[PDB]
Ligand binder design. Sequence first.
Ligand SMILES: Nc1ncnc2[nH]cnc12
Ligand SMILES: Nc1ncnc2[nH]cnc12
Ligand SMILES: Nc1ncnc2[nH]cnc12
Ligand SMILES: Nc1ccnc(=O)[nH]1
Ligand SMILES: Nc1ccnc(=O)[nH]1
Ligand SMILES: Nc1ccnc(=O)[nH]1
Ligand SMILES: Nc1ccnc(=O)[nH]1
Lengths: 520, 520, 520
Amino acid sequence: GADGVGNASGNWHCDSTWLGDRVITTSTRTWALPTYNNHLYKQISSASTGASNDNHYFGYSTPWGYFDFNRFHCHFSPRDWQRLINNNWGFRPKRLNFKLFNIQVKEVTTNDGVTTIANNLTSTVQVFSDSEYQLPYVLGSAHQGCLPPFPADVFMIPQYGYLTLNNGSQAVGRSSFYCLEYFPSQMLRTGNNFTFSYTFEEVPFHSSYAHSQSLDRLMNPLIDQYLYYLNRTQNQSGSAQNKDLLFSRGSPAGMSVQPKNWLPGPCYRQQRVSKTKTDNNNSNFTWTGASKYNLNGRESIINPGTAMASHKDDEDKFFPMSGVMIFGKESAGASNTALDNVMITDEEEIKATNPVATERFGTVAVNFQSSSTDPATGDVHAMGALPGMVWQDRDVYLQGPIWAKIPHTDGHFHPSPLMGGFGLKNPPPQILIKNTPVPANPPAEFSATKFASFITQYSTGQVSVEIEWELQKENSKRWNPEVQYTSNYAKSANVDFTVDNNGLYTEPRPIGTRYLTRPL
Amino acid sequence: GADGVGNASGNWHCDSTWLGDRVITTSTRTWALPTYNNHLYKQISSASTGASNDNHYFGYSTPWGYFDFNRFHCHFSPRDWQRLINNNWGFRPKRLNFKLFNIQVKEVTTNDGVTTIANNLTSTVQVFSDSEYQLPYVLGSAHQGCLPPFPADVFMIPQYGYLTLNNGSQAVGRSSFYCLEYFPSQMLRTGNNFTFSYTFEEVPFHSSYAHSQSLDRLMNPLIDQYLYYLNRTQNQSGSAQNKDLLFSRGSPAGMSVQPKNWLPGPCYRQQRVSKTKTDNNNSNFTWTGASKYNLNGRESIINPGTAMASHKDDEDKFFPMSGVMIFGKESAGASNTALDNVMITDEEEIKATNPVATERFGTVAVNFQSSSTDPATGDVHAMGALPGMVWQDRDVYLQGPIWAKIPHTDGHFHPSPLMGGFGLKNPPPQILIKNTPVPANPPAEFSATKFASFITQYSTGQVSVEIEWELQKENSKRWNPEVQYTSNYAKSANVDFTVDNNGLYTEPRPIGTRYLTRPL
Amino acid sequence: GADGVGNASGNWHCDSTWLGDRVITTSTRTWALPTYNNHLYKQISSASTGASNDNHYFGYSTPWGYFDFNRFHCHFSPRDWQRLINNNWGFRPKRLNFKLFNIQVKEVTTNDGVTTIANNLTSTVQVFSDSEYQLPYVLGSAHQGCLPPFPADVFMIPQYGYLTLNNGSQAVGRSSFYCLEYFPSQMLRTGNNFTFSYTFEEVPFHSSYAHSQSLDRLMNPLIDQYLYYLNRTQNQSGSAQNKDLLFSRGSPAGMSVQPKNWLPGPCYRQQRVSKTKTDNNNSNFTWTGASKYNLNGRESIINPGTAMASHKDDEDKFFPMSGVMIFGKESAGASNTALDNVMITDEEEIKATNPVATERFGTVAVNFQSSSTDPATGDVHAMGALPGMVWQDRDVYLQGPIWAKIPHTDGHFHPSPLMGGFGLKNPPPQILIKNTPVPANPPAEFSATKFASFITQYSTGQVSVEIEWELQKENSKRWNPEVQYTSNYAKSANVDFTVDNNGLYTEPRPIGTRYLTRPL
Ligand SMILES: Nc1ncnc2[nH]cnc12
Ligand SMILES: Nc1ncnc2[nH]cnc12
Ligand SMILES: Nc1ncnc2[nH]cnc12
Ligand SMILES: Nc1ccnc(=O)[nH]1
Ligand SMILES: Nc1ccnc(=O)[nH]1
Ligand SMILES: Nc1ccnc(=O)[nH]1
Ligand SMILES: Nc1ccnc(=O)[nH]1
């Protein structure tokens, strides 16, 4: 860093600047970091517990905390998101600037049942960015502890832990252990500060638009095709039914039978469930009726799974059991909370190109028809990629994640993070931070045994993240007005995206980005 | 070439040089080339024979031989492979240098029942590289006849033959015939030599590592998600069972139900068979229970097929019927040999990302549940590519192939050779070689009829291949030690990868490359 | 020194960098230093005690602490050690850089109960390196208190004390007393830091290899010698036994009787003891059956003593009573702990050249044979250096010492530290450190009586040691694969060289360096 006890090492830079094709978000917050695990690394696992085989794990927990800004509301105020989404066909991150500063380390002494805090001026906090990605990448799993949406909220830094290979609750020889200290890290006293910058790789702009055409309506509703298709295998009222081969040319009255160039996207069917409970089966079918994948004898719910439309027209009451992103309200309990404490996303806009999530992809022949054998077909519920398929990826949300690390594998296929966002080979590095252990008084006589008595402390300061975002401007010739995200004009007891009478900021709904429209 | 009867046209260059990010393998061997087909091109096919429709073919056999180094042990000694695999996250070929030399053509005369060999000094051997790929590409089908693993072994050059279109055992008008002479070729007497170089296209480094995380364990086992999922469709001990909609947030106790970004790789299920025969069905089900593809009314076993893990945890006794590479021991007979004369590979390391080969990919919804209709799901056994899938390709082995030509098609999809290795648009060219016909004595009076009487001969010499390989160095922060390929320290009658008391080199096991670990 | 209360004077530099022929280890840790002896130097000795004459001593204890990094795990993580040992025939230290910084001095006050710690900002810690070696050299006696293996562990600094001449528990006129203050030292307040560098003398690379030949198997196993040896002193079935002189030439069937050039190493026999207690004698024979040296009427166990192989082939259950380095587990008690709380090294690799530790060196003639007198021979249990002897020094271990000061004597003989490592004429200097006394309040009236009332304090900070190591690369033409140190692939409850569920780092075995092989 820096300088004095008596001298701030950073100012408060929270702002938005719009500049034609760029928008620069700056956000600064005040954090608090406790001591974790008493400065220990612990082995952790599902041993005992009583966990099922699909829940076993092995890993470690760490004395470190970390910074996480991997949520859009860490950077975009509600109004800015609104600006973003109502005027642009897309956007992407380009560069970032990160700042830790104004650090202040404090000691806690308890006597009684009356707790005193003071400054420990000569104490440090340690920091580093894992810029060579040598640590297990724990961002992009949508874990809580990101910078809060509301700039006035103070936040506690999450603790870093990670998993490795496990065979049940045991480890394997291949399992990996990381000690964080065995990086180089920067050591900061109250005077000092930390900074680094980062550039994002080139990535496709996120599609902030719905289509205003669908795959099956790309033709000109005024002209025939020059192409023919088999229309009838029997006449044709000449009594009664006689084998025939009758061919018709593509025609505006038969848009369902016209040859075309393209196929809709992939499909992994999911179970349709209603918001009115009375429609559903009387059982507990989530695990048992769930779409799951099977990995080394362990089952995992596919969630949210392939980008698919949530419901066809007029059926907004249904949703895939595990195919929509779902946010909790600020009233929601951790487990088995009710419908009205959650907010379910809707990905209905993609039904122009993407199969609906709770229906078949389609139908396939399954035999050879003949006079003796009747033509049979079967339903296709899971369809991989076929040449000619086109699709739309899952939408992002003001409160969803931004990016994830693409796994380091021989093979990916369209590695856009299924929960939504940008896939990055070389994503924003993890930023780790810890209070340096400060021994309590040692004995008068040497002892070799692990030092286990420490002065209790924690730290606080500010953090600042600045991101530059490039915009894809809208160039639309559409004559009529667009759907636009808008707040509600009718009167009410509270304003949306505001604090209440107890000062609790709330986000009353998810907001996606798909309001403007393109042609296909 | 060159020069004298009395003057070598090449030396013996067999070596290894390690140079930081590069390793240069040189190997030289001594070959023998007979006269094939008596200098004739023969039409060949399955006519007569009694072959089934799935085995019919049409093609030609050729008077030529060819060189084949498309196996790792043609270049890497066992110790070098060990060096490779224990210290690098990857590697790829960059360039090659090829050399034919010290040629010596010999005539064989038999009188009795006592066979005399002498030098035929004025005789040639012919050579060319098919550098414009004008010939059917016969490398990359894993045919025997490559340079031997052991530098002291002499090898016989394989004969070139190829196939074309066939309708049963007949040909079609579209079928193609190639005459090799109707290239330009180099003609070598005992003095001369042949050389050429080649550069490899840019290709992804082969992944010589296992992952130490799995797709389903990428989260931080310490923090909840901000995302919610439908947890129950009924309460919840309020008696008895009542329709409900209950939502929970992602949590470390429920890692199987957390939303995620990624899907595991593709899947084409295969039949699971045990190494202890008593477990299996009492029938012959290989063709009949086999995963097969169907091409122009002809069936073909998919083998090895999609890259998939061989068995889940603790089940090393099972293997896909035709989903693992299998090497023969030097005791193995050509057909119906026993389990202990073969070596079956294990691709278990990829179960972090790739479905296990003998299980479903997963489960899919197949109907609409309601009070009247119970939720149904189905098993998915063959799953194509879905956006968001990530996977690991099949491993290579010290004795497996290196590369294959990607077919010249409009479309490939991840054209990594399914048997393992590097796909190359423009692979190392085939190198063809033949002894020039040397007429026996003609008659005293002209005759127009095909010349059919030849002096019997063959040739021998050395061949040298030098390849430069680029290495991907390991940069791992892992605190604990790695699994490392190691020879066995316990005492025995023979050393691994050695010759025995009769001078037979043996390779006692396959060695893959996946020992070091990455994060995902 | 520089600057501020508010300003870190050092960062955290813990890392490893591999660069071809060099590897640079950096390690940084956080220490704690109490006040020792209440700022007093005390005379100490075995007086009273009840000590045997063998355990009498005289010396002094000091108010100072010291830094000790003389253990390989202070610098090499387990993975790095693995890298070291599996790829290099040797290595040596070249240069070092040392850093003390971020110091923070604290005062402790108690009422009862209850104990209060604050910063004492104007307090100093003192430091110096004994670079002219003017102090008794107390490193290289394998003391505990070195930097901990695990970078996250905080450590207490050991106290400096030393011994001098003693006659029983009394001193002699020749006994030396040393006052540490009498040395210039650097005085550091919370702002300041200490640094120095050092270069190592030229030393032989440590042998990180086993031989793959033995002294007695160097001959060509195909060819006779031209040399002859007396084979028989009687015939030879011509009945019955008659005096004769019969000579044979060296031959592959008689490799035990072939003339040779070399002798195996020196020998000081030690008592063989089994790991299965039932094999041993029923008595307490360690002191009484021990190999001891006798110095000024005082006995001392020779331990570990001459470099000798721990056991011959197939006898891994025996070990020299005091001829192997033995590490304690983190469960081991200080005294009379059980077999399974210790880890015994094995120096079996050196049996190619070095006598086995529990057997005779060999046999010697002891008389003149004649018709009247039968040839006699005797066993040699202690053999000094003979021209022509060759030997291998004791191995080093990841947790053993690195170096020791060669005593300043007229004569050494192969002064490689018998406990293992590098002998250094001018070793890394001792680094001494102390909290400066801070008087409590004096009386209002002068008193000359030596001050004795002090404010209670201690200090803490970071220390950093960087060492450059030169590597001897492996150049082996060995065709088959090597033994390699490897972690175990089978599954278990804990990972090797990791922390457990209480955060205790453990080292589950010793690791030597001898895996690669040389010829002799
Ligand atoms: N969002 C995304 N990030 C990186 N690569 C992609 N390829 C397709 N979509 C992508
Ligand atoms: N091994 C490989 N060779 C060429 N192209 C590839 N694309 C993906 N894997 C490949
Ligand atoms: N390790 C060592 N250090 C210094 N001198 C030696 N002489 C023989 N071995 C030695
Ligand atoms: N990864 C991809 C494959 C095919 N098309 C895409 O847009 N992306
Ligand atoms: N061919 C490929 C398609 C998608 N992803 C890959 O890695 N390769
Ligand atoms: N000549 C010597 C041999 C060994 N050591 C010595 O100091 N001198
Ligand atoms: N000290 C020594 C004497 C003789 N030879 C050695 O290598 N060392």
